[PDB]
């Protein structure tokens, strides 16, 4: 460990005390834009790697989309530890999102709930952004191998959401190792955008073909049109939300393997728990601890549907190596974290691979890619 992070994390517990949380998240971008975040130097366990098809992640963890919607900070936090990074939600237009405050807390439940809205910069900057990680990349020792995904989201106004994703795929692509569709997000009418499977079907058909576009009309080869990390086109995932009933989910895994999507993240926030005191006022979905045991639920459920063919990105509720592992043998190759950060502070990357490492060999696993479904 370090000073640094022991520094950092008082100063975030401060924060967390007194001032709101969507200030707390900017000040931290602003620290990480301006690079005085710690790092983590540590080489990753080779007995923790994992993939997603022909997609190598260093470690099992990374940063879930809403974190850095504009990816203004990137570099920074990537370098506290995770392997990869989901940028954005995006949308082609800049938004406010809906009005301030948007995020509250609840330290007692290790709990969040927000109405964002889709708030970002939009699209055009946004590239402009990920463009200049991208340089800084070639160039960062740290930054090699480390995986950035991309989330792009229907715009507030907009009736129509396949215009609203080709557009921000070809702006964008480029420079994405993956895409997230993601119909899953409260906060945009109504309440859900659709993943009526007809309509998801026609979506992830939809996204492919921009993606098969761009490949066919660069005259470009693949290390000059992909300026990413794995020089390939970006895989196509979709973000799914918990809030659906036993049907709509057969419904949904057929679509995923008739489409051959690349992989489904599961799953988005909540808007099902009312347990939670301070929330009781409270409009949007719900992040952290009590988020676990649901979505842990919707995992094994569609990698059941899915005949375990789809891989599987998991969130949320994961704050410890267990949490970790409860979701890897449910069925998930990845992780992602968003409310730990909130909860832990700049640790959370160090200590929950540690965490891991050490349940994997006290679980008699030789490698994590063995526990990927191992409770059937
Ligand atoms: C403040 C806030 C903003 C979020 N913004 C997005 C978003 O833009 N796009 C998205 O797909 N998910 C968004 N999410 C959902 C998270 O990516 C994640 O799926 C969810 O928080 C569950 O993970 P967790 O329990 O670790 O927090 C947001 C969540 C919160 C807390
Ligand atoms: C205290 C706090 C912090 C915060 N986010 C935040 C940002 C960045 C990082 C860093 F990457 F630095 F770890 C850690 C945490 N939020 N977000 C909503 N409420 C919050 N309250
Ligand atoms: O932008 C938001 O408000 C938002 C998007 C999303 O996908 N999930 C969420 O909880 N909030």
Redesign the pocket.
Known sequence: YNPEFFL?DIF??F??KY?D??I??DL??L??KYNI?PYDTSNDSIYACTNIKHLDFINPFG?AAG?DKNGV?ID??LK?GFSFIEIGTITPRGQTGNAKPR?F?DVESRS?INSCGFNNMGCDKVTENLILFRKRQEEDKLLSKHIVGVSIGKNKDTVNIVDDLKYCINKIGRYADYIAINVSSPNTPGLRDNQEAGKLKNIILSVKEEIDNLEKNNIMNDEFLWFNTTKKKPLVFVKLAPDLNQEQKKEIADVLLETNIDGMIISNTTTQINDIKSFENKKGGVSGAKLKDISTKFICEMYNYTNKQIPIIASGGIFSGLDALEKIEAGASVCQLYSC??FN??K?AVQIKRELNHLLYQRGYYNLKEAIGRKH
């Open positions: 950092y975030l517990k924060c967390l001032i949380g969507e707390c998240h931290f971008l620290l990480g975040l940063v974190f900070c920074s936090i506290l995020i807390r969040i950060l909130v502070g700049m959370s």
